[PDB]
């Protein structure tokens, strides 16, 4: 599950609805430890 919001707010150009900034968890090499990460995605690959 991705917790995610819009990146680059209050922008008045054409490119607004793209560039969402999400955050998720992911396992590391130790299977008992987990990891937090920040990343970006375009609009056409995420769905609420």
């Amino acid at each position: 599950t991705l917790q995610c919001t819009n990146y680059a707010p209050n922008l008045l150009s054409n490119m607004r609805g793209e560039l969402k900034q999400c955050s998720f968890n992911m396992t590391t090499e130790l299977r008992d430890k987990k990891q937090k990460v920040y990343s970006l995605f375009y609009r056409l690959d995420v769905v609420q």
Binding site: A8, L11, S13, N14, M15, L19, L40
Partner: protein, 48 residues
């Protein structure tokens, strides 16, 4: 992330030589449809 300026990817094409190319290809196309028939181009229809 983004270092710099949010922009939008695009493509250019030289205007005059594209028009001349379309004017050439419609001259070759008229050999199957008499001399005077209205030829019109249009956008795509649908699909993915």
């Amino acid at each position: 992330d983004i270092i710099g300026d949010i922009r939008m990817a695009h493509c250019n094409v030289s205007k005059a030589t594209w028009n001349e190319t379309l004017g050439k290809v419609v001259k070759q196309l008229r050999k199957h449809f008499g001399n005077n028939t209205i030829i019109r181009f249009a956008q795509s229809s649908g699909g993915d």
